[PDB]
């Protein structure tokens, strides 16, 4: 049984240009999967202010978060790590930066590497293919 | 220092192709090429086969058709492999893919496989590298 913050809700899968769907498993670990069918990849994205979202994995009940040190992790409770900057890019895809945390005046991104692992935020750049996401409507 | 490699061309790849217009590419029972929003349509399962460096053939497995475009720029399904089935597979800066006719250009400019907003096959000649319609992500099928 899931909840959301006050805001504009939409239901999506997030598929990286590294060709993984983002999921958070029952253990709160954040990974990619090739599985088009995976229920831990169904996300509720709610906009709470302009360009600011909280992304929750419905079927595990975790928020996609990133911490000061720049690790992706799953958070049971909403907190400041769960605020993300959603930038609708260029042509056809989105990026998700830490709202709260920078590295050397550089944004830190949610990214899935080529073997489907989460990246350490310090190593990520907006131009990266790992940090690009084609949202796909769930229903 | 010993390259290690992961995306070298050769081995077949079982994929769907997902347009940025938000449809999966299929070829029906009857060789008609279209997009679906359905995540589980068996006509959207493709076999992508490297024929030469820079060139692929795309085959809808469950209808036994190749994806093709003729000289007149018409995107169609083809039961036998021929030169209209040769496609330049190309990866753009942003990281999505384009598929263009190997043989057929128009105004010197190249012609792309493309699905529009209502997921209809686009007219060869009316496509541009730029176009959201002409961008795909392949997704793995198990």
From Swiss-Prot, chain B:
The keyword Acyltransferase does not apply. Disulfide bonds: none annotated. One of its GO terms (cellular component) is extracellular region. One of its GO terms (biological process) is actin cytoskeleton organization. One of its GO terms (molecular function) is type 2 fibroblast growth factor receptor binding. The keyword Secreted applies. It is found in: Secreted. Keywords: Disease variant, Ectodermal dysplasia, Glycoprotein, Growth factor, Lacrimo-auriculo-dento-digital syndrome, Secreted, Signal. Glycans are attached at residue 131. It comes from the Eukaryota. It is linked to Aplasia of lacrimal and salivary glands: A rare condition characterized by dry conjunctival mucosae, irritable eyes, epiphora (constant tearing), and xerostomia (dryness of the mouth), which increases risk of dental erosion, dental caries, periodontal disease, and oral infections. ALSG has variable expressivity, and affected individuals may have aplasia or hypoplasia of the lacrimal, parotid, submandibular, and sublingual glands and absence of the lacrimal puncta. Lacrimo-auriculo-dento-digital syndrome 3: A form of lacrimo-auriculo-dento-digital syndrome, an autosomal dominant disease characterized by aplastic/hypoplastic lacrimal and salivary glands and ducts, cup-shaped ears, hearing loss, hypodontia and enamel hypoplasia, and distal limb segments anomalies. In addition to these cardinal features, facial dysmorphism, malformations of the kidney and respiratory system and abnormal genitalia have been reported. Craniosynostosis and severe syndactyly are not observed. Belongs to the heparin-binding growth factors family. Plays an important role in the regulation of embryonic development, cell proliferation and cell differentiation. Required for normal branching morphogenesis. May play a role in wound healing. Interacts with FGFR1 and FGFR2. Interacts with FGFBP1. This is Fibroblast growth factor 10. The lineage of its organism: Eukaryota, Metazoa, Chordata, Craniata, Vertebrata. The gene is FGF10. The chain holds residues 66 to 207 of 208 of the full protein.
């Amino acid at each position: 049984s899931y909840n959301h913050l006050q805001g504009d809700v939409r239901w999506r899968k997030l598929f990286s240009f590294t060709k993984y769907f983002l999921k958070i498993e029952k253990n709160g670990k954040v990974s990619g999967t090739k599985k088009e069918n995976c229920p831990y990849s169904i996300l509720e994205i709610t906009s709470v202010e302009i360009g600011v979202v909280a992304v929750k994995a419905i079927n595990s009940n975790y928020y996609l978060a990133m911490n000061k040190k720049g690790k992706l992790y799953g958070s049971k409770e909403f907190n400041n790590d769960c605020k993300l900057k959603e930038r609708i890019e260029e042509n056809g895809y989105n990026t998700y930066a830490s709202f709260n945390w920078q590295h050397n005046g550089r944004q830190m991104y949610v990214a899935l590497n080529g073997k489907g692992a989460p990246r350490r935020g310090q190593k990520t750049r907006r131009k990266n293919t790992s940090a690009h996401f084609l949202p796909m409507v769930v229903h």
